[model samples]
Target: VRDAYIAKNYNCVYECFRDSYCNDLCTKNGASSGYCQWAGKYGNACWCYALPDNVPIRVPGKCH
Candidate 1:
C-alpha cells in the first residue's frame, strides 16, 4: 500500500470518493484499491494498495 498523496481538505476527501476513476485507475496501475485517511488538522490524505515494488510513494501531480 501507498500513503503519500495528500488531500488538503474535506472537499478533497469527498472529491476522492466521488471520483469514479480512482479505484480502477489505481487497480490498473497495480493497486487493489484507493482510499483516504484523516490526518488531524489537514483534514485527510490519500493512499493506495499495490504490489510490493508497485507501491507508489508520494506520487506527484496527485495532490495540490
Candidate 2:
C-alpha cells in the first residue's frame, strides 16, 4: 500500500504517548492525530501520525 501522506514523530514513551499528547502534537502542526505505533525495527521506539489518512505530509527527517 502506498501512502500519499506520512509523518514520523519521535520519543512518545509509553508514559507519554497518550491521545492528549498526540492531539496536541498534531494540532500544533495544523493537522489531526492518527495513531501511535512502535517505530518498526525497534520495538521500544514510538511515533505518531500528525495527520489523518491520504493527505500530503512533511518528513521530519531525510528520507532513507
Candidate 3:
C-alpha cells in the first residue's frame, strides 16, 4: 500500500466542521483524501492523507 501522512491547512481560518469539507480542501491541494482531526496538538484541524511531495507533513509521529 501507499504511504500516507497528516497535514494541516494553513489557509483555513477556523476549525474543520466535517469530513467532507476537509476532504475537499485536501483534494484541492492535491492530497488523496482527508478528514477533521478533532484531537491532538492541532485541535479540530484538517488533516490530509496521501499528500503530494510538495506538501509538508505536520503530524510526524505514529498513530497508535
Candidate 4:
C-alpha cells in the first residue's frame, strides 16, 4: 500500500485513509483486515495518508 502510494502518487494506489472517504480495496482482493479508528462500523479501508500535523501519528521507521 505504501509502495503503491509512493510509486503511484495516490492515484493508481489504494487510498486507505481519506478525509472525505475511506475506500476498501484489500478485502475485495482477499487480504487480511485491519480496524480503522475513523470508521469503527466499517471493517475495510483503501486509502491512507500522513495524519494532519495537529494529529499524533506514529512513525516507526525512516522513509525514503
Q: State which candidate has the highest lDDT.
A: 3
lDDT against the true structure, per candidate, is 0.44, 0.38, 0.58, 0.28
Q: Candidates' TM-scores?
A: 0.38, 0.33, 0.60, 0.23
Instruction: Give the CA lDDT, 0 to 100, for residue 35 in model 4.
Output: 23
Best by TM-score: 3
Clashing pairs in 4: 15-46, 15-47, 16-46, 16-47, 16-48, 17-47, 17-48, 23-46
For residues 1-64, write the lDDT of model 4, one tens digit per residue.
2311211232233224542333233323332322233322222234234322332222222222
Error of model 1, residue 64, in angstroms = 9.6
Q: RMSD to native for every prediction?
A: 6.6, 7.0, 5.8, 11.9
TM-score, prediction 3: 0.60
Task: Give the lDDT of residue 10 in candidate 2.
Answer: 39
Candidate order by TM-score, decreasing, is 3, 1, 2, 4
lDDT for predicted candidate 4 compared with the true structure: 0.28
Candidate 3 lDDT, tens digit per residue, 1-64? 1123345453232267888987887767777887766665545566676657776555533222
Error of 2 at 60 (Å): 11
Question: Ten consecutive residues with minimal summed lDDT in candidate 3?
Answer: 1-10
The residue-by-residue lDDT of candidate 1 on 1-64, one tens digit each, is: 5434423332233235433455554455566675653454434444545523544344333344
| Collision pairs in model 1 | none
Candidate 1 vs candidate 4, lDDT winner:
1
